[PDB]
């Protein structure tokens, strides 16, 4: 913070004005600036057009846009609105790529079942009409003060309608439609960059949220894209107008002249800076030619949304904020878009540890998911209760989504627990017949300044997991400073995996013999040997289950949907094993251990 203020003073050549301070306090905050993770993320292998979402081609005619963000700090103080809004925001990111939001996936980490979080998410995804196709839930008293709310959203988009995430030429303009701008969330980005005992941990930093407004925003935006009116786009969230406008031009290496007075207000007494950093929801920033602005405004208004032309794209690398004919601020656009970078430390792993038992409560509760009808599997090739969620796109074309993390293992060894989480995410994808395609990930950490190693260990392990597996990183998020009066959460890296699979070849449950296939302990080397065995059996028609517990209550619940009931003598397993359960007619034949342990029937 203060180390940064000096750097700002040196660059500015003098002391910043009130608004200059407010503005950089947002853009250079860890949440928007990424000072501590910038270099690490760069060292990661990438793929797919990365524009605040990350899209991956599936069949050349269609691509899937998937991204994972989080809303941790907000949810610790206002569970209901913090979770909902989290969904609202990640949906705007996927929509901002020209994609049609088709699936939401949740990843909760709490010390008990906080109804608010569950409902906030279910209600919001419900009012906008986008289904929940899955979502891991880990309970541990270690998240008592810092619950982690990570949400993954995937949309489908035509390869020929991909929207850019930046401005591309001087003369373009920037329209901002959606809900009206109020005073909620000001500095909520600076709030998410500190310990929960900060001076900004008040309800003022929390964003509201209106799904009916968003559903409209989804319809309007897609219409704009269908008529080729969108030349570039970015959703609004942290930083509001400031963040969005400056980032669309910094990316293109252009400039902008923002006119705050043209921004639709919901509170007319607001001041220029309040209008600039307000983090109100349901708003989208579209880049286009001056001429198309007319139809875009018409489309949003008839859709019951406000908005007007707010900025002009100029070739000069300056960010000029205007309110009428009175200048508010003015600084080098590339100054804002780039926070000071912090040095990284090199991490070198040790031997895979003898992970001991550290259980995460088995509070399986579908009761709460039914009360708030948080349906998790209405329209998938095969039910999500089993793990991977498979969606169709064509009769014989589809993709899989897997969200996994092993904070339990990582808590003991940041490196190995993380690396293992990424690898296990591959077993699941393979277990359903899908071809690992890319990864979106969310890094959930505490104080980097205090414990720099642990962060380094997460990023190195994630980097090594992609090099060892060949699976690149399409996108991600990084939530740091998840601590309460000192105490930090466990290092929790949540992995979102996307895969390619023919829905006509996805196996379903049927009366059969069950087999424990693999080893009860972990060894990196032979990991690729299990992968090869899953591909073989999966290809033969076998129904495979890849859980860290082998068999869970949900699996059995889901099994009853088929009127099937399993009787198996599960093998004793270590905290990190290399085993999966195979269901087939005959005994599997593979270059890996196989043992008949039970039966599925009726
Ligand atoms: N751990 C990670 N791995 C890979 N990419 C990551 C990453 N963390 C961040 N990114 C990439 O950096 C980009 C920026 O995330 P950032 O949180 O700063 O902005 P944003 O685009 O989400 C808008 P906002 O701040 O308004 O929410 C992401 O869109 C993603 O592609
Ligand atoms: O509406 C936009 N939501 C997008 C967004 O970027 N929101 C911002 O992130 C904070 C949570 O970050 P975390 O604690 O999870 O790291 C939240 O308080 C918002 O200011
Ligand atoms: Mg983010
Ligand atoms: Mg965003």
Swiss-Prot record:
Q: Name one GO cellular component term.
A: cytoplasm
What are its E.C. numbers?
A: 6.3.5.3
The organism's superkingdom is given as Bacteria
Q: How does it assemble?
A: Monomer. Part of the FGAM synthase complex composed of 1 PurL, 1 PurQ and 2 PurS subunits.
Q: What is this protein called?
A: Phosphoribosylformylglycinamidine synthase subunit PurL
Q: Which pathway does it serve?
A: Purine metabolism; IMP biosynthesis via de novo pathway; 5-amino-1-(5-phospho-D-ribosyl)imidazole from N(2)-formyl-N(1)-(5-phospho-D-ribosyl)glycinamide: step 1/2
UniProt keyword annotation of Metal-binding present: yes
- State the Gene Ontology terms under molecular function: ATP binding; magnesium ion binding; phosphoribosylformylglycinamidine synthase activity
User: Quick one: which residues bind substrate?
Assistant: 70-73, 92, 188, 207, 279-281, 479
Q: What does this protein do?
A: Part of the phosphoribosylformylglycinamidine synthase complex involved in the purines biosynthetic pathway. Catalyzes the ATP-dependent conversion of formylglycinamide ribonucleotide (FGAR) and glutamine to yield formylglycinamidine ribonucleotide (FGAM) and glutamate. The FGAM synthase complex is composed of three subunits. PurQ produces an ammonia molecule by converting glutamine to glutamate. PurL transfers the ammonia molecule to FGAR to form FGAM in an ATP-dependent manner.
Q: Catalysed reaction per UniProt? A: N(2)-formyl-N(1)-(5-phospho-beta-D-ribosyl)glycinamide + L-glutamine + ATP + H2O = 2-formamido-N(1)-(5-O-phospho-beta-D-ribosyl)acetamidine + L-glutamate + ADP + phosphate + H(+)
Q: Which cysteines are joined by disulfide bonds?
A: none
Q: Which residues bind ATP 1?
A: 34, 67, 441, 476
The residues that hold Mg(2+) 1 are 69, 477
Cite the InterPro entries for this sequence.
Answer: PRibForGlyAmidine_synth_PurL (IPR010074), PurL_C (IPR031652), PurL_C_sf (IPR038411), PurL_linker (IPR041609), PurM-like_C_dom (IPR010918), PurM-like_C_sf (IPR036676), PurM-like_N (IPR016188), PurM-like_N_sf (IPR036921)
Q: Binding of ATP 2: at which residues?
A: 106, 135-138, 387, 428, 548, 555
NCBIfam families per the UniProt record, alphabetical: FGAM_synth_II, PRK14090.1
One GO-annotated biological process of the protein: 'de novo' IMP biosynthetic process
Q: Which organism is it from?
A: Thermotoga maritima (strain ATCC 43589 / DSM 3109 / JCM 10099 / NBRC 100826 / MSB8)
Family statement drawn from the similarity comment of this UniProt entry: Belongs to the FGAMS family.
Top enzyme class of this protein? ligase
What is the first-listed, main subcellular location in coarse terms? Answer: cytoplasm
């Amino acid at each position: 913070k203060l180390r940064y203020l000096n750097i700002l003073k040196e660059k500015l050549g003098r002391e910043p004005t009130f608004v200059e301070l407010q503005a950089f306090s947002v853009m250079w905050s860890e949440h928007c600036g990424y000072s501590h993770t910038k270099k690490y993320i760069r060292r990661l292998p990438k793929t797919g057009f990365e524009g605040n979402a990350g899209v991956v081609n599936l069949d050349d005619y269609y691509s899937v846009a998937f991204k994972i963000e989080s809303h941790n700090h907000p949810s610790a103080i206002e569970p209901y609105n913090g979770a909902a809004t989290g969904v609202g925001g990640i949906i705007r990111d996927v929509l901002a790529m020209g994609a049609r939001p088709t699936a939401i996936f949740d990843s909760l980490h709490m010390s008990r079942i906080i109804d608010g979080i569950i409902e906030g998410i279910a209600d919001y995804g419900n009012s906008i009409g986008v289904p929940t196709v899955g979502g891991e839930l880990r309970i541990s008293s270690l998240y008592a003060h810092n619950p982690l709310v990570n949400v993954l959203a995937a949309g489908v988009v035509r390869n020929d309608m991909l929207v850019d995430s930046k401005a591309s030429r001087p003369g373009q303009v920037i329209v901002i439609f959606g809900g009206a701008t109020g005073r909620d969330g000001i500095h909520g980005a600076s709030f998410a960059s500190e310990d929960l005992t900060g001076d900004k941990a008040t309800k003022l930093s929390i964003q509201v949220g209106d799904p009916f407004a968003e559903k409209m925003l989804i319809e309007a935006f897609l219409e704009m894209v269908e008529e080729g009116l969108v030349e570039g786009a970015q959703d609004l969230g942290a930083g509001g107008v400031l963040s969005a406008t400056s980032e669309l031009v910094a990316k293109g290496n252009l400039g902008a002249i923002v006119h705050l007075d043209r921004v639709p207000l919901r509170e007319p007494d607001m001041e220029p800076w309040e209008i600039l950093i307000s983090e109100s929801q349901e708003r989208m920033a579209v880049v286009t030619s001056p001429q198309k602005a007319s139809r875009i405004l018409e489309i949003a208004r008839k859709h019951l949304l406000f908005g007007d032309v707010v900025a002009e794209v100029i070739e000069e690398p300056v960010y000029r904020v205007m309110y009428r004919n009175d200048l508010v601020m003015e600084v080098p656009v590339q100054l804002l878009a780039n926070a000071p970078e912090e040095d990284i430390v090199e991490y070198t792993p040790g031997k895979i540890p003898e992970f001991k038992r550290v259980e995460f409560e088995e509070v399986n509760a579908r009761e709460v998911f039914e009360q708030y009808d948080h349906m998790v599997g209405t329209d998938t090739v095969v039910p999500p209760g089993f793990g991977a969620a498979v969606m169709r796109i064509k009769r014989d074309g589809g993709y899989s989504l897997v969200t996994h993390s092993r904070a339990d293992l990582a808590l003991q060894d940041t490196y190995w627990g993380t690396l293992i989480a990424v690898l296990e995410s591959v077993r699941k994808t393979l277990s359903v017949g899908a071809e690992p395609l890319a990864i979106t990930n969310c890094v959930n950490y505490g104080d980097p300044d205090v414990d720099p190693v642990g962060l380094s260990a997460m990023m190195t392990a994630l980097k090594n997991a992609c090099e060892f597996s060949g699976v690149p990183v399409a996108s991600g998020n990084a939530s740091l400073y998840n601590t309460y009066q000192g105490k930090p959460i466990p290092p929790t890296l949540v992995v979102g995996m996307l895969g390619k699979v023919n829905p006509q070849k996805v196996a379903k449950p049927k009366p059969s013999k069950v087999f424990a296939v693999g080893w009860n302990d972990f060894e990196l080397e032979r990991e690729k040997e299990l992968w090869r065995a899953i591909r073989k059996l999966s290809e033969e028609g076998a129904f495979i289950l890849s859980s860290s517990q082998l068999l869970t209550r949900t699996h059995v619940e889901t099994f009853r949907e088929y009127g099937l009931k399993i009787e198996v003598k599960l093998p004793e397993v270590r905290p990190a094993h290399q085993m999966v359960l195979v269901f087939s007619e005959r005994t599997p034949v593979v270059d890996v251990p196989v043992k008949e342990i039970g039966t599925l029937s009726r």
